[PDB]
Amino acid sequence: VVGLDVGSQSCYIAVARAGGIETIANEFSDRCTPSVISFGSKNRTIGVAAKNQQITHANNTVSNFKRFHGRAFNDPFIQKEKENLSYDLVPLKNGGVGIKVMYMGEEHLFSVEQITAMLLTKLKETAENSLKKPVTDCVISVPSFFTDAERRSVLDAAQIVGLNCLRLMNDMTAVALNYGIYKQDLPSLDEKPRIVVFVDMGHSAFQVSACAFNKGKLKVLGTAFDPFLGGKNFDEKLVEHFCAEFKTKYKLDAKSKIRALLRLYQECEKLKKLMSSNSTDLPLNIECFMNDKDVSGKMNRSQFEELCAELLQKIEVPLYSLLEQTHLKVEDVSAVEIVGGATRIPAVKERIAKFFGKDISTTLNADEAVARGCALQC
């Protein structure tokens, strides 16, 4: 049974092997498969070869589509999202979200179920190349805020592939189960349960849960979330900043050309990630940005944090929500464990730590924890 963490930006694959849980590496020997599909004239590509083409083939490269599951085109959520995409979003005949691209010489209209199914197919093939056997049974991750329609949409995708999804697993339940199996020296059943808070901020959302653990027993006490706050919001802030800085210094409007704006998003995200390990002034350099002009600017962590002041304030809100629901007090919590790509942002970690009055723990592998939990389920 393969565990599949299908993220809006990246995917991971895990499976129970002899002894424990292993992540499965792909044809680039990587655990991480970008959630990106590129449609060419002779074929299509999925993963990093698609992602590497995202500027060159921007109109026919599809990404960040996970949050379209179970959504109507007319939803203000989708109307907003639509504006930032390099590819065409149109309504399907049933009102759902349609993805229009040029493919095998012809115009194609895809549902999100169909797009996700193309991604699932690659992951399935990846697992089969490593295990040297057919893969059918799987567990697929879903955010803990996904509604029943959004979940059914993901199941519909898996059925298109011919996968037998035994279970859609809540990301935070994935993480909890992972912890519950791997954490050493949990309390005995005859001891006071250990209350752990899990925080997962990915590209598109912020999720938090509280769980009580004993050896062989897990109880989820509550979950909270901001489905509209993730790593990408921070990218957006940097992009808006440099877009204006470049209008001033170079009189170039990045917003006017989509492939320049995309490239600006790429650079700002790279910059964001680097500021997690480097606090000094860091270069942003984009060769031949537009009108053959090279552009340049700089940024450091402290300035990034000031720019993202309002976003960082939003971090404590789901934490407050969690306590409100569970009636837990921070002193009840033994540890705060982080997982996911964007929780690593030092200002985000700091806000969490200050809220619970505890240092942040990193017992689990932040990138792999969800897939590993999915692989544990069955």
Binding site residues, ligand ATP, CB under 6 A: 7-10, 66, 202-205, 230-232, 269, 272-273, 276, 340-342, 344-345
How far is residue 163's CA from residue 158's CA, in Å, rounded to a whole number? Answer: 5
Q: Choose the one of ligand ATP, Mg ion, none that binds residue 232, judging by a C-beta under 5 to 8 angstroms depending on kind.
A: ligand ATP
Q: Does 361 bind Mg ion (CB under 5 A)?
A: no
Compare residues 66 and 237 and give the one whose CB is closer to ligand ATP.
Answer: 66
Compare residues 182 and 356 and give the one whose CB is closer to Mg ion.
Answer: 182
Q: Choose the one of Mg ion, ligand ATP, none that binds residue 344, judging by a C-beta under 5 to 8 angstroms depending on kind.
A: ligand ATP
Question: For the residues of 274-286, what is the DSSP string, one character each?
Answer: HTTT--S-EEEEE
Q: Choose the one of ligand ATP, Mg ion, none that binds residue 372, judging by a C-beta under 5 to 8 angstroms depending on kind.
A: Mg ion
- 165: DSSP letter: E
Token representation of residue 268: 């700002």
Compare residues 122 and 203 and give the one whose CB is closer to Mg ion.
Answer: 203
Q: Does 47 bind Mg ion (CB under 5 A)?
A: no
Q: Choose the one of Mg ion, ligand ATP, none that binds residue 204, judging by a C-beta under 5 to 8 angstroms depending on kind.
A: ligand ATP
In whole angstroms, the minimum distance from the beta carbon of 46 to ligand ATP comes to 15
Q: In this structure, are residues 339 and 202 in contact, taking their beta carbons and an 8 Å threshold?
A: no
How far is residue 118's CA from residue 47's CA, in Å, rounded to a whole number? Answer: 11
In whole angstroms, the minimum distance from the beta carbon of 127 to ligand ATP comes to 18
Alpha-carbon torsion (254, 256, 260, 266), positive or negative: positive
CB neighbour burial string for 74-112, b if at least 16 within 10 angstroms, e if fewer? eeeebeebeeebbbbbeeeeeebbbbebbeeeeeeebbb
Nearest to 266, CA basis, from 235, 291, 231: 235
Q: Does 154 bind Mg ion (CB under 5 A)?
A: no
Q: Choose the one of Mg ion, ligand ATP, none that binds residue 369, judging by a C-beta under 5 to 8 angstroms depending on kind.
A: Mg ion
Q: In this structure, are residues 119 and 35 in contact, taking their beta carbons and an 8 Å threshold?
A: yes
Q: Choose the one of ligand ATP, Mg ion, none that binds residue 114, judging by a C-beta under 5 to 8 angstroms depending on kind.
A: none
How far is residue 54's CA from residue 59's CA, in Å, rounded to a whole number? Answer: 8
Question: Pick from 364, 371, 374, 375: which binds Mg ion (CB under 5 A)?
Answer: 364
Q: In this structure, are residues 201 and 230 in contact, taking their beta carbons and an 8 Å threshold?
A: yes
Contact set with Mg ion (CB under 5 A): 7, 202, 364-365, 368-369, 372
